[PDB]
A paper describes a structure:
The sugar-binding receptors dectin-2 and blood dendritic cell antigen 2 (BDCA-2) bind oligosaccharide ligands through extracellular carbohydrate-recognition domains (CRDs) and initiate intracellular signaling through Fc receptor γ adapters (FcRγ). Dectin-2 stimulates macrophages in response to pathogen binding while BDCA-2 modulates cytokine production in plasmacytoid dendritic cells. Each of these receptors consists of an N-terminal short cytoplasmic sequence and transmembrane domain linked to a C-terminal C-type carbohydrate-recognition domain (CRD) by a short neck region. The oligomeric states of these receptors and the orientations of their CRDs have been investigated by analysis of a naturally occurring disulfide-bonded variant of BDCA-2 and by replacement of transmembrane domains with N-terminal dimerization domains to create extracellular domain dimers of both dectin-2 and BDCA-2. Analysis of these constructs, as well as previously described crystal structures of the CRDs from these proteins and a novel structure of an extended version of the extracellular domain of dectin-2, showed that there is only limited interaction of the CRDs in the dimers, but interactions can be stabilized by the presence of the neck region.
This fusion product elutes in gel-filtration at the molecular weight of 44 kDa expected for a dimer. Analysis of new crystals formed by the dectin-2 dimer fused to the dimerization domain provided further insight into the interface structure. The geometry of the CRDs in crystals, which contain two dectin-2 polypeptides in the asymmetric unit, is almost identical to that observed for the isolated CRD. Two additional amino acids, SerSer at the N-terminus of each subunit, are visible in the new crystal structure. The extended interface in the new crystal expands the 4-stranded antiparallel β sheet across the dimer interface observed for the BDCA-2 and dectin-2 CRDs, contributing to a more extensive surface area of 453 Å2. The extended N-terminus introduces two more hydrogen bonds in the β-strands connecting the monomers, between Ser62 and Ser68. Additional reciprocal packing interactions can be found between Trp76 of one monomer to Leu209 and Leu64 of the other and between the Leu209 residues. Since the dimerization domain is likely to form a coiled-coil, the fact it is absent from the crystal indicates that its position is not ordered in the crystal, which in turn suggests that the neck region of dectin-2 may be flexible. The two additional serine residues visible in the new dectin-2 dimer crystals described here project to the side, indicating that the neck could bend around the CRD-CRD interface to link to the transmembrane domain.
Residue numbers in the entry:
A (entry chain B), B (entry chain A): 62 to 70, 74 to 209
């Protein structure tokens, strides 16, 4: 039963103490490995969703919290395998950022999006099979007090 | 700048991140050495006063944050040297606890009070010269949000 709260120039914005804060959102990085649907379930049970990246500044902050030997499920999927990628919170895909790696996405049967570290580019999105187990990242709104 | 907040079952009660929480107060243990007048001013510059002990449970909590080799100023003083001890917040001295060590207080000229660790009793209060330099303990109301 613990928040941490930072000053605002509302006078406080807050996140649970074991999460991470940036912008108008809290984040949680899960080091357990699950399929995509159960990764979404774990976030929901904390009152959040798989992460949605809305600007480059946001991603830049998330990647410094991650371990480079692991890949991380995002909230971006294509459930009919016809490259109609959707964000888990319905914000439009085409008008927003799309930080895919070089030569990705590239398979119709790889219907989930993950962020992963490849040299020489570093972090970027790769599409993968939704039924293989990986880490995840959640995001929810800040609490304002 | 940060606060830490605990559920209250007014829904949150908080304290600044580097302080300590118990009951309806936040506490700070200053490990610099000042005279009694400057120990008080230092607390005031943080929006606090030197500590007032109101029950024994409160004191049991504080001395577990303290270093047994050091003595600490209290918000309790006798300005005219006639044993009319008063609390810094004007709470009545008689209808309240009085954890003086055995054989204390004992000098009209020792007009400030401090908490100190004496074998065998352990922790308890002792009257001392205000113009000696010691550690101190600040207390302030909880911020509620
Ligand atoms: C080595 O990486 C390649 O193999 C994985 C299979 O998991 C693909 O998803 C990825 O896009 C690449 O083509
Ligand atoms: C170590 O304690 C003794 O000496 C201090 C002097 O500060 C007195 O206040 C106290 O009563 C004791 O006699
Ligand atoms: Ca976002
Ligand atoms: Ca792929
Ligand atoms: Ca008190
Ligand atoms: Ca004394
Ligand atoms: Na795909
Ligand atoms: Na005295």
């Amino acid at each position: 039963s613990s928040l941490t709260c930072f000053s605002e120039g509302p006078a406080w914005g807050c996140c649970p103490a074991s999460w991470k804060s940036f912008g108008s959102s809290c984040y949680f990085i899960s080091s357990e490995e699950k399929v995509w649907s159960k990764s979404e379930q774990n976030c929901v049970e904390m009152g959040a969703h798989l992460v949605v990246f809305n600007t480059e500044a946001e991603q830049n902050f998330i990647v410094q919290q991650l371990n480079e030997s692991f890949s991380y499920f995002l909230g971006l999927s294509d459930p009919q395998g016809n490259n109609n990628w959707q964000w888990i919170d319905k914000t439009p895909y085409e008008k927003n950022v799309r930080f895919w790696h070089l030569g990705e996405p590239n398979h119709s049967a790889e219907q989930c999006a993950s962020i992963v570290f490849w040299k020489p580019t570093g972090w970027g999105w790769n599409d993968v099979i939704c039924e293989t187990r990986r880490n995840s990242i959640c995001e929810m709104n800040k609490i304002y007090l």
